[PDB]
Amino acid sequence: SMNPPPPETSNPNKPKRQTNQLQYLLRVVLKTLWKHQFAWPFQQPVDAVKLNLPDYYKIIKTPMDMGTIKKRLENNYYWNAQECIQDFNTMFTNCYIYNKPGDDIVLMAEALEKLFLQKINELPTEE
Ligand SMILES: COc1cc(/C=C2\SC(=O)N=C2N)ccc1O
């Protein structure tokens, strides 16, 4: 059993910005989801070896998790807020694609997604 390498979190030739929307994504959005009681499965890449999910990376070809997002935000990896919002949405969608409705992990993702949507609704205008 093998896990793929994680998503990229460092790339010196990718242009980067530090913007008020990206600061909101770290200070408000990521921090709110990270502290939630259902955050733990999403705080690092899925370890398909330890979890005995040998088909996980056959089905999920664009993996994403909040550990990766946290690193991207803390290392100013992004150019704009849309790129980070897409990462969160990829994380939720992967969970719904791989699992069954009503599975514990899906209910956990849904609770985090509800908070995510609430916070993104008040994403500040770009200064
Ligand atoms: C079973 O599908 C998923 C599993 C996880 C992670 C888990 S599950 C567990 O017990 N520990 C973990 N770190 C994350 C997203 C998924 O879609």
**What DSSP string describes 25-77?**
IIIIIIHHHHTSTT-GGGSS---TTTTT-TTHHHH-SS---HHHHHHHHHTT-
Ligand 1 pocket residue status of 99, Cβ below 6 Å:
yes
Residue 5 in domain: no
Q: Specify the resolution in Å.
A: 1.3
The residue whose CA has the least distance to atom 8 of ligand 1 is: 41
Which residue reads 């709110």 in tokens? 32
Q: What are phi and psi of 30, to 5 degrees?
A: -60, -45
Cα of 25 vs centre of ligand 1, distance in Å, is 23
**Tokens encoding 58:** 């056959």
CA atoms of 86 and 68, how far apart (whole Å):
13
Give the count of domains, the chain.
Answer: 1
Residue 72 in domain: yes
Stated as kind and residue range, the H or E segment containing 1 is none
CA atoms of 52 and 101, how far apart (whole Å):
20
Ligand 1 pocket residue status of 106, Cβ below 6 Å:
no
Q: Which amino acid is at 109?
A: A
Residue 4 in domain: no
Q: Residue 95: give the domain boundaries.
A: 19-123
| Cβ proximity of 41 and 108 under 8 Å | yes
Q: Is 86 left (phi over 0), alpha (psi -120 to 50) or beta?
A: alpha
Secondary structure of residue 92 in the 3-state scheme = helix
